Amino acid sequence: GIPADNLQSRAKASFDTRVAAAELALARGAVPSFANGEELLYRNSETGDPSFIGSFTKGLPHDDNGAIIDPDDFLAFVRAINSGDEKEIAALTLGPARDPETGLPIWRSDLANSLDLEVRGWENSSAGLTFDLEGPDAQSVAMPPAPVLTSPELIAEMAELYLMALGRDIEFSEFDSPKNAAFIRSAIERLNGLEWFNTPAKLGDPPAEIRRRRGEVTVGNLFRGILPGSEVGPYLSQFIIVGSKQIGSATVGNKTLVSPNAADEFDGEIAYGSITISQRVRIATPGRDFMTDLKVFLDVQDAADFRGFESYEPGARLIRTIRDLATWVHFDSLYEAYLNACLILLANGVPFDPNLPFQQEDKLDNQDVFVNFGSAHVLSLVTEVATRALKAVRYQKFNIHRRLRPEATGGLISVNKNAFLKSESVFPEVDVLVEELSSILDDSASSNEKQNIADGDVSPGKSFLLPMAFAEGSPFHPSYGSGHAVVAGACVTILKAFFDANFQIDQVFEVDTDEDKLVKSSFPGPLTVAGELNKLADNVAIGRNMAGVHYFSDQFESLLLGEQIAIGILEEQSLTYGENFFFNLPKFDGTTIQI
Amino acid sequence: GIPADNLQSRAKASFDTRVAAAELALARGAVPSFANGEELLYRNSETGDPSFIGSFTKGLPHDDNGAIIDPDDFLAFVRAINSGDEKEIAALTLGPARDPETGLPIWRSDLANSLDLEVRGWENSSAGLTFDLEGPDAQSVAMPPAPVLTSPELIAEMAELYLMALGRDIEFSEFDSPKNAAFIRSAIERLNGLEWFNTPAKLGDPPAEIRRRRGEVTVGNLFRGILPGSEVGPYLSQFIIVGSKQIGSATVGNKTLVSPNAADEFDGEIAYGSITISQRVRIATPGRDFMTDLKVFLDVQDAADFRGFESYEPGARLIRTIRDLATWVHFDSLYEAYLNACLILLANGVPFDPNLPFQQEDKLDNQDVFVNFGSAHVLSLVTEVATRALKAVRYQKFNIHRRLRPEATGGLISVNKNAFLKSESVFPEVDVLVEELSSILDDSASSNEKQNIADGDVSPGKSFLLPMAFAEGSPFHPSYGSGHAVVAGACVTILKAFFDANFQIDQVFEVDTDEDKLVKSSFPGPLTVAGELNKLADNVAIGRNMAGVHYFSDQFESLLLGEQIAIGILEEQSLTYGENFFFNLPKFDGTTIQI
Amino acid sequence: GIPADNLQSRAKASFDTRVAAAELALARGAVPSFANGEELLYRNSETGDPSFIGSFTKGLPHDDNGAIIDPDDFLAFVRAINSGDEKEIAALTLGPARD
Amino acid sequence: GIPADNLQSRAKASFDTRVAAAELALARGAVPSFANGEELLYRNSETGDPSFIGSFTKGLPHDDNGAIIDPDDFLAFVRAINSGDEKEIAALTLGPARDPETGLPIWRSDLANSLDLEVRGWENSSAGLTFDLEGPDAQSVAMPPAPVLTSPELIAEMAELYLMALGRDIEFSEFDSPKNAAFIRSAIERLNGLEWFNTPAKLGDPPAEIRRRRGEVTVGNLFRGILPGSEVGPYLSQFIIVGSKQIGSATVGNKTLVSPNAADEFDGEIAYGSITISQRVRIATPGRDFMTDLKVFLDVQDAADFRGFESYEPGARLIRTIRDLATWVHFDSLYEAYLNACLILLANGVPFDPNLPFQQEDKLDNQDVFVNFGSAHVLSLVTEVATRALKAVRYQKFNIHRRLRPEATGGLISVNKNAFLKSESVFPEVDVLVEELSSILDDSASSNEKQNIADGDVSPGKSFLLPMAFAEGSPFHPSYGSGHAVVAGACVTILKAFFDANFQIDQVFEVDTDEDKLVKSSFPGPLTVAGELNKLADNVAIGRNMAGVHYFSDQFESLLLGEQIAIGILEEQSLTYGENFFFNLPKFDGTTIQI
Amino acid sequence: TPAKLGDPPAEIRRRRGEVTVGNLFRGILPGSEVGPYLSQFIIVGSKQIG
Numbered sequence A, B, D: 001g002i003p004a005d006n007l008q009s010r011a012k013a014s015f016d017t018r019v020a021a022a023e024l025a026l027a028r029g030a031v032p033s034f035a036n037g038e039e040l041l042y043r044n045s046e047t048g049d050p051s052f053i054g055s056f057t058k059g060l061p062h063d064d065n066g067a068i069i070d071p072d073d074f075l076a077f078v079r080a081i082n083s084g085d086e087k088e089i090a091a092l093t094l095g096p097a098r099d100p101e102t103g104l105p106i107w108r109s110d111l112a113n114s115l116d117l118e119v120r121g122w123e124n125s126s127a128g129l130t131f132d133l134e135g136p137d138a139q140s141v142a143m144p145p146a147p148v149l150t151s152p153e154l155i156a157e158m159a160e161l162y163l164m165a166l167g168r169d170i171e172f173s174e175f176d177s178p179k180n181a182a183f184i185r186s187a188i189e190r191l192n193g194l195e196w197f198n199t200p201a202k203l204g205d206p207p208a209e210i211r212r213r214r215g216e217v218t219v220g221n222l223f224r225g226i227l228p229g230s231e232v233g234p235y236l237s238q239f240i241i242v243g244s245k246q247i248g249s250a251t252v253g254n255k256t257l258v259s260p261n262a263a264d265e266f267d268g269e270i271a272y273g274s275i276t277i278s279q280r281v282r283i284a285t286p287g288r289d290f291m292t293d294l295k296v297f298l299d300v301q302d303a304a305d306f307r308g309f310e311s312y313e314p315g316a317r318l319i320r321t322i323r324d325l326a327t328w329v330h331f332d333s334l335y336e337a338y339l340n341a342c343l344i345l346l347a348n349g350v351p352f353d354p355n356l357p358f359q360q361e362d363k364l365d366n367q368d369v370f371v372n373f374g375s376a377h378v379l380s381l382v383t384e385v386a387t388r389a390l391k392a393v394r395y396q397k398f399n400i401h402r403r404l405r406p407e408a409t410g411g412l413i414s415v416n417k418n419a420f421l422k423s424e425s426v427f428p429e430v431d432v433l434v435e436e437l438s439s440i441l442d443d444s445a446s447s448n449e450k451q452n453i454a455d456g457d458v459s460p461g462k463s464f465l466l467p468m469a470f471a472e473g474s475p476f477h478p479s480y481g482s483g484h485a486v487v488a489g490a491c492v493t494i495l496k497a498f499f500d501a502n503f504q505i506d507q508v509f510e511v512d513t514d515e516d517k518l519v520k521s522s523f524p525g526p527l528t529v530a531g532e533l534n535k536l537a538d539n540v541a542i543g544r545n546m547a548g549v550h551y552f553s554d555q556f557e558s559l560l561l562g563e564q565i566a567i568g569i570l571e572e573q574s575l576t577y578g579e580n581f582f583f584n585l586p587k588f589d590g591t592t593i594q595i
Numbered sequence C: 001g002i003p004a005d006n007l008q009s010r011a012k013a014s015f016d017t018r019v020a021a022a023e024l025a026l027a028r029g030a031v032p033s034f035a036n037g038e039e040l041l042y043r044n045s046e047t048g049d050p051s052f053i054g055s056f057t058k059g060l061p062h063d064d065n066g067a068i069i070d071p072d073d074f075l076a077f078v079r080a081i082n083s084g085d086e087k088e089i090a091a092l093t094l095g096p097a098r099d
Numbered sequence E: 001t002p003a004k005l006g007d008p009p010a011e012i013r014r015r016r017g018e019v020t021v022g023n024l025f026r027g028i029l030p031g032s033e034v035g036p037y038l039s040q041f042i043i044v045g046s047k048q049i050g
């Protein structure tokens, strides 16, 4: 007989497709996650117990030097993370001692006590235990060990964050302007004096380190990411400052119609359906930074809820300063930047990936696209990968590495350096970190003294704390990896698969140095969609660093993790279509995968 | 021994969760879809063949009376829909005869020939064959048979659409104003003269008909939907006209901060992260309707691509007229309205469903929400259900019912009534539909004569065509059900499950009758989130009817279908969480399901 | 009892040997193939479309500079490669214009 | 829903294709193999034990009459065959008594002792237990029982073999020449005096016997096989004597190019890529036959390793005599003849089977062939079937029938006839065989006496042994079936499926009677590819008979077994292609199967 | 110039160094650079029957 296949009922074929996808996912294998070993390394000299200084302990009661008071509070917290039991999380110790009549926390700072602040809790500390109906399971993927406190890498990461905090009110369009030369030149020479940047990796180093190690800092790569496309052209992705084509501009047969609102494109207006999105961001008070006083910093480490304490100027403007990019990433919904990028691309008519079905003229294939392979498809797909990626990064954040946020590291530096001047030893583990950042810390103590004077906040010693752009500092979850960066990675992977990513963009804009408007850039162009989508991912991720809440390595590693999650979802979803097609996807490493 | 369970590796538990969800879906069963029987009922008197006049045939070559020329073109189109083969879809007959030198279509109207229009193709005619990794399979659910051309129901649906087209430039806030009394009163008395509205269902009628049958028309229910909440208060949902709370307004312990941009709330500004969405919509030229001339209408039925031919006024305004709601639903991304509603709810601090985990103060449960049970969760979930719902409605649209769009029905009415005045019989099947709409058709012929004069479009006879708000008329896919309404249904089901849906809204706004601004309504309130989310679903769905592209029954039935799709996804996803919780969901029928 | 193995018919043993080898091959895993990214990188200046100058296009109609005339001819070629359908291969454009 | 099939991962589909093939093979069923019953029939008069005279016992110690000395040696040998255990094989008794001082075997003949010959071992006695990844398992197929020593069929087979040995230096082209008429006519007459050939089968005879029984011997069928095509035209297949078209001969559009080496085609040069294969074979010394002396014969049955002892004339020539065909099959690689034919067919441009995919002009199908359905595919397939066919004949040879080689049967005849001349009875079971061959034996004793005189070998009595063309006689494995003929059957089956087997060959060549060159034959032609490929299989298989190492029945039965093995491989491999096609295969029985 | 740390491993494995007459136009499989350019197996004959 002739070899054949049999049909089955529709219901059974649907069931079998779901199982087959599940089998695909199971066959990929699971990789183990290794942490850097710091967790139990650092010990308390007096008791011999682990001090947990290189670990996330925000929320647990701390002592005056910023170390937790009771190691059992951290060990109970870890057990709670790994079980996910709601009652167990409710029995944890959160916040400082409470007053017997008020029942309210007793804070160290006059500021926190005068506001009657209450405590805030951990955000989804067991989201990494949750399964998902599509994509790689959260625990099946891994991020490599984070940099340790005594490494050249961390030294360079902290130097870069302190300089971003001192240069927060510098305008992106004026990086090469004579008014900022003293700061820019001193920033670059200080970073180029650190071994991470001025010496190459050595044979024998871990591959993950070799891939994220950076070379010589220049004005052209200062504070930028390293995804392909991020170092070409202006700092800011076109997609976070320009508008789109507007309703009313169309080509109808041989006639060209011009929208009566066409100028909105060049004024940061994205056409969103029949309404609009404005790219202008709220303006946080220039020059006002937070958590520059030791007692307020310790209250925030002990959970004081300072959310919502920032002050703003009236109006809005196109992103101008480093601070505005920090403000943008303080409140964005997590797929916001990529959904807005997508809307510009749809409104501007950028073509879909030419390997998708039915992209030719309708006269050749009789089939337009929308639900599948069209705008509705990409609009749901870019947003749905976000929670799958977050589940994976929550497993890394809480269940595996528990890396301390940058503000805690600045806490360790401030305490050690102040003890040193009083001829005392506190946190000897950061002695080399403090010695190598010495000229940077002198500038920061002087900037923090002005901030503390202006706020009327007094604490003993100089303050070498890292100035935060946000009143509450970082969110209530560990630093490695990052929710913004994991989502960026997954979302721009979907968009580069769905759109013709190498299509060129010929109009390059930047924000004017004098007015709140867009001007033609001096960079000729063209740029490609892929490089400006990669740039946008880097802008949102590095924005979190500019706010003081992540390190470089958190961002870069999380971008790669989100990329894997997105690729995994597309592969499993490929079993559902009967058409003959594939997604052409340019990865962050420069190679292409066809799915 | 003591009875127990065993653990398994994480990978295997993830695989087993996916299979278990697949088994849940398989156990729900699949229901058959029945069509109304019209497809092959209507015959051509001369050949005896099926004429397909009650079927969607947009794109296939039509004769001068609007009937397809060759029945085989429709029969080949059906085969192509059911196979999904790309080459088979490419071999179909699309558009009219082409000119041998140009290769361009030969149109009937001077307008289409003067623009050199080309053809447009069908949009995803086989999307209903696609499987999905989550939720009910597209073919496992059903929509009941659509109303037939000779039924009282269709008569009332067409009367309502012609009156919406004549009242397109009437303002929602002026429905009860003396300047519109002659039109409003005549609209209500004519609709109340039709049996659908003035006589109740009879024992023995199909249950689906009894559920969507409407009673007496009044100013308070005129042009409204029937979801619970839609008939209370102002016509327009608060969520499509107001803004939200802005960044800078916060309560920090005992101190209340006021945003310097707080007034933006009351000016239609939604806080979107740190940027904004404006609720003001583009303004289509008032009084300009389309496809009111027979030859241009036949060219559009033969696929002439008129997309992008509308003209607009400069600027934007809060939705004011029926036409503006049509313009809003011409270009919205499909989950746009619900994502914007969600952003208002998050920015205003409306509480999440109190049965979700960790909603108490952090001091009682030590756990904030974001990834799971928080904003990121609902923001991905509301958008991801959209493509699952569209797959189901595409199966109904193309594979089962293939209902003709309202413009084709107006085509049948115009041809029959013109033949009748010349003592001739064309399409006798609509004789009763034409007789019962007689006074309405007199008003419409007079409005269409003015439109055709203004455009310089000439065709023999009077024009009783349904005026379209869009130059191209309906999209290139059948009328029953609707993509907008199926998505509305699924998306507001997710939001009413995730948010505390019965929470009350005490500030009720409407659009001012004199200026482009929001004013306090005369309706006292309060309203609930569920009723205003249901209203919003009805506003977007009924907006498609106001544009002339759907009937009432298309919308209502599609809302119920999307609701089922959403409930199915939530049930399957409930197997992934280890927490103890459930979604409390108020359905469109007034009952609650806990998931 | 003493641990043992059982014999089976020859035919079964032959069947089980072929299945065991298929299982060994399945257990090796499958690795993905990544391409260098050139295919869609190079663009035609006038139209903005991919020019495919870094890709095999032997057989498709070329212009006087050696670049393919129509990008759709390459895209249809790639679809036909991935499906293997004989009729789809036969409908491709091969060679220059004919007399 | 619409019935459907689901996709699965590539890996999973490969795994299910291999399982499906295995299932196909299991579903064919396995047939038992029946032997002829002789193994244990013959008994030793003195002890009553089985004597094993009708079984292969080469290698086991024999007595002076050629019977094994100890029956336990044969029974241990059978156990070793069935287990395959290497140690058990190593513990068997091989060769004669050895000298305590030298360790060397003690032989009977001066010749073997003077050369210090060592023993040679059984070749792969348990290759019939090996499984395979493709095709019918080796024990799943069967050959029918072999002819018994006292049958008419064996009498006929031995008469033919003795006549082949006496005619070894006769030229194929001079079969009907007056110089050979005394020998040819007496050969025909003596074969036509035997019942097997002069009397037809009778109703009730086993069907396998009816199919291989031959009729009246003529010059046209003398020494030929019975596959369709072997009796048409010249004795030797064109593929073992002609060369092929050479590089440089081609048609390029309208221009015909002629190779500068075109004449090579008619001089026996096959184009092998860019180098050549010569059809001229080494020339074994004319008139020199082996094992014509009783003692040397006994040493050979006792394992004396005489391999490599033949002498040759300088140079090479196109196959000319029966001896040259025997020389050809002495050392050929087992698929050599069929690969060489395949190369001739590819170089001459014979078409592939027209039912294969893509064989039309490239302008009609856009697809040339090579890997699949082209030259690389058939080049690997024709050679890979060889080891699968050998495993099955190994099971037949050792595990089932264990048929004595023709040389052993000649030893029985010689011993019995000499005992009779001396008034003694030895091996009474072959009395009838000896009586019916009486005239042939007289000629053979006379030729054997000349051979022994020329070699200086002396043994008591006349010699009626079967003169061997090879010094070592047969290979170290049983006679039924044959490795050359099982491979011939499988390999030509593959070639007839892959090429257009009925294409005609119009140029027919033969080897010249006077010179070493090809001449146009007197047979007009045409011949077909199928007929000449079947003829080639018969030429190689009957050349083994010409050497004295096989009987007729061995070859014909093995050709049928090889055919089945090849068919089973094609059927299992048909599950691996997605194309629509099939192999048209003309079988040895005249019918065609489509796979 | 040699490969650099950070380059793809597949590139490091096939990168070739300084060209000499001894390696000109040769492959890099072990044994290809020893002795004559052409393998013995593409020029020599074999032992013959006899």
Ligand SMILES: [Ca+2]
Binding pocket: A358, A359, A360, A361, A362, A365, A366, A367, A368, A369, B121
């Ligand atoms: Ca298209």
Ligand SMILES: [Ca+2]
Binding pocket: A121, B358, B359, B360, B361, B362, B365, B366, B367, B368, B369
């Ligand atoms: Ca809480």
Ligand SMILES: [Ca+2]
Binding pocket: D358, D359, D360, D361, D362, D365, D366, D367, D368, D369
């Ligand atoms: Ca061909």
